[PDB]
Design an enzyme around this catalytic site. Structure first.
Site, short mmCIF file in Angstrom:
data_model
loop_
_atom_site.label_atom_id
_atom_site.label_comp_id
_atom_site.label_asym_id
_atom_site.label_seq_id
_atom_site.Cartn_x
_atom_site.Cartn_y
_atom_site.Cartn_z
CG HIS A 107 -0.58 0.22 2.51
ND1 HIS A 107 -0.16 1.47 2.96
CD2 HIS A 107 -0.63 -0.62 3.57
CE1 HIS A 107 0.10 1.32 4.26
NE2 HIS A 107 -0.17 0.08 4.67
N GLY A 161 2.28 6.00 10.38
CA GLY A 161 3.71 5.92 10.07
C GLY A 161 4.35 4.63 10.57
CB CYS A 214 2.36 0.89 7.58
SG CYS A 214 0.67 1.36 8.03
C1 LIG Z 1 -9.33 3.00 11.35
O1 LIG Z 1 -8.05 3.62 11.52
C2 LIG Z 1 -7.71 4.76 10.70
C3 LIG Z 1 -6.73 4.35 9.58
S1 LIG Z 1 -6.57 5.27 8.06
O2 LIG Z 1 -5.77 6.44 8.32
O3 LIG Z 1 -7.86 5.43 7.49
N1 LIG Z 1 -5.71 4.32 7.06
C4 LIG Z 1 -6.39 3.67 5.94
C5 LIG Z 1 -5.69 2.37 5.59
C6 LIG Z 1 -6.34 1.46 4.76
C7 LIG Z 1 -5.73 0.27 4.40
C8 LIG Z 1 -4.47 -0.01 4.86
CL1 LIG Z 1 -3.72 -1.52 4.45
C9 LIG Z 1 -3.78 0.88 5.66
C10 LIG Z 1 -4.39 2.08 6.05
C11 LIG Z 1 -3.64 3.04 6.95
C12 LIG Z 1 -3.63 2.52 8.39
O4 LIG Z 1 -4.50 1.76 8.82
N2 LIG Z 1 -2.62 3.00 9.16
C13 LIG Z 1 -2.40 2.82 10.54
C14 LIG Z 1 -1.79 1.70 11.10
N3 LIG Z 1 -1.59 1.50 12.41
C15 LIG Z 1 -2.01 2.43 13.24
C16 LIG Z 1 -2.66 3.63 12.84
C17 LIG Z 1 -3.13 4.61 13.75
C18 LIG Z 1 -3.74 5.74 13.30
C19 LIG Z 1 -3.91 5.96 11.94
C20 LIG Z 1 -3.49 5.03 11.02
C21 LIG Z 1 -2.86 3.83 11.44
C22 LIG Z 1 -4.25 4.45 6.89
C23 LIG Z 1 -7.52 6.00 11.51
C24 LIG Z 1 -8.70 5.88 10.56
#
Ligand SMILES: COC1(CS(=O)(=O)N2Cc3ccc(Cl)cc3[C@H](C(=O)Nc3cncc4ccccc34)C2)CC1
Ligand SMILES: COC1(CS(=O)(=O)N2Cc3ccc(Cl)cc3[C@H](C(=O)Nc3cncc4ccccc34)C2)CC1
Ligand SMILES: [Cl-]
EC number: 3.4.19.12
Lengths: 305, 297
Positions: free
Chosen positions: B41, B135, B137
């Site tokens: 991603h 950040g 990931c």
């Molecule tokens: C439901 O959590 C949210 C995630 S997001 O920002 O919409 N996001 C969308 C998304 C989609 C697919 C995939 Cl594989 C990765 C992601 C991203 C994701 O998951 N990142 C995160 C991982 N680990 C902790 C995170 C804490 C905060 C933010 C993001 C994090 C980016 C806050 C809304």
């Protein structure tokens, strides 16, 4: 999101762990530049431990009596001296893996990571706090002496603890890296016991602010308290007194969540009175006191849920 | 004495963490030999998005050094960036896929720089209860067996309940998840029974025996009770695996099951076990044996 007991990455400390042997005793040492630091009780027998005269035991030793092993390499000891309860072994080779470091003496309530070692080999890393009674609730078996506690804010390792002994209650006692013990403990097999322990109030408050940041507010109430009325209640539950310094230190977390320190103190008072009623806070059914205000700001997001 | 949530020493993994940037997205990568592994991603029709990229679009930074990407390919949900320099700090390693209930250490990273290490378990619902911010990931999970690092997890996303989801190092997700912004939720979770039993044996080893009783049970009666408290079924394999701890403490596995049954029906009554007021399920039988024996790496 999430809230774990998080330790610092241990790599910078792993490259400093060595094994120190003197006669029948084997323990761990910290190799920084051309010096190996280890507990002075490595020169003792089990009999010596009752009333050891370290100065008399040390004068009878020569450099070649101390065997130091770094990985599969034998280091040559070229000097030795005692500073308080630590032995400093001067070696022929400087550690090429020496990180940027400082020796810091911490106060009760402060947290740090412990790299538990046996035979100069690291086995695990965990997060600890210096209890108000100056002991630590570690996980250590025989042979762990010389294992160190540290923090790594930025890329500098601040060494704050060296393990020396286990007390009868299973808790642990040790020194700073200058050999000064934390608490009234002595490196002697003496009748010594940890004093009555108390809860680190400023840390429980910090953890309640971490819970609010992560989205949980069930424990809050409409009340406030004076600092004095809070301490009168807190003392009844074996909680450490909260000082104006602690209130000042919690300022940033108060401004981020919008909950005044004395209002968060009111919530703590009510939690102590009522318990959790089947609920948890950050996955815990007890009030957690091993996260400092600094640890919460480091681990939690800068944006409240 | 003492029993802590202990992680493996992270040094061998720290020397593999790099920062990967593609366009506006910055995340972490794992540099092993001449390949950087990271979540795909960082670039949805992933093959269509990938064909439009060239090697120079991927910026890889190891410390203060820029690595040159000379090739790229996708394996499931993981991107493999071929680089010009082999990691001189590559440890002895394997890529392993773990099962729910197994534990591992997570080296949480931001901008290719390690910030912390913690221990966790793959939940029966295939999520992990980690601690991650934006950040993170590309941060990895691992175990150490002797001198060999077994990489088992790469972080991909956070679910709405605050729990985390990711893949093995071959890019296969743990759980029914996908790497896209869509409606997905963690399933109802259960408690890892064999791990709670292992932790009760750790408590006995550490001198906590108040929950011990004279009773024993059958595997069938225990499983009927465990199913009612959202506990995972206990199998004969779990009983066999707990054999060593049973012989050390002198408490038969179904004897410890009768204690657990009484703890589920009556609670702790104001008492704690190893400093906890809840039954802990994130220590496996091997974690208990390892911490109560001092195995080194
Ligand atoms: C439901 O959590 C949210 C995630 S997001 O920002 O919409 N996001 C969308 C998304 C989609 C697919 C995939 Cl594989 C990765 C992601 C991203 C994701 O998951 N990142 C995160 C991982 N680990 C902790 C995170 C804490 C905060 C933010 C993001 C994090 C980016 C806050 C809304
Ligand atoms: C309360 O007695 C114990 C320690 S001992 O074996 O009597 N012992 C006496 C003693 C006295 C003073 C000093 Cl400075 C060091 C020591 C030693 C000591 O503390 N070692 C240990 C350290 N850290 C965890 C240990 C777990 C187990 C064993 C030993 C450990 C050696 C638990 C058995
Ligand atoms: Cl301090």
């Amino acid at each position: 999101s999430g809230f774990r007991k998080m330790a610092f990455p241990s790599g910078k400390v792993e490259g400093c762990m060595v094994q120190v042997t003197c006669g029948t005793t084997t323990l761990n040492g910290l190799w920084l530049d051309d010096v190996v630091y280890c507990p002075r009780h490595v020169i003792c027998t089990s009999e010596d431990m009752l009333n050891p005269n370290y100065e008399d035991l040390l004068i009878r030793k020569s450099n070649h009596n101390f065997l130091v092993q770094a990985g599969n390499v034998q280091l040559r000891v070229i000097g030795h001296s005692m500073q308080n309860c630590v032995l400093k072994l001067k070696v022929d080779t400087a550690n090429p893996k020496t990180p940027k470091y400082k020796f810091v003496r911490i106060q009760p309530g402060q947290t740090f990571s412990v790299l538990a070692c046996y035979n100069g080999s690291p086995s695990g890393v965990y997060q600890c706090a210096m209890r108000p009674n100056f002991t630590i609730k570690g996980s250590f078996l025989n042979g762990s002496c010389g294992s160190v506690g540290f923090n790594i804010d930025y890329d500098c390792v601040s060494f704050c603890y060296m393990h020396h002994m286990e007390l009868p209650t299973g808790v642990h006692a040790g020194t700073d890296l200058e050999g000064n013990f934390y608490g009234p403990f002595v490196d002697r097999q003496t009748a010594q016991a940890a004093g009555t322990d108390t809860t680190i109030t400023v840390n429980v408050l910090a953890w309640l602010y971490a819970a609010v940041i992560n989205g949980d507010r069930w424990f809050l109430n409409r009340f406030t308290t004076t600092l004095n009325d809070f301490n009168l209640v807190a003392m009844k539950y074996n909680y450490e007194p909260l000082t104006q310094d602690h209130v000042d230190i919690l300022g940033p977390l108060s401004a981020q969540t919008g909950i005044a320190v004395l209002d968060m103190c009111a919530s703590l008072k009510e939690l102590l009175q009522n318990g959790m009623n089947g609920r948890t806070i950050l996955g815990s059914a007890l009030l957690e006191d091993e996260f400092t205000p600094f640890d919460v700001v480091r681990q939690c997001s800068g944006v409240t849920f």
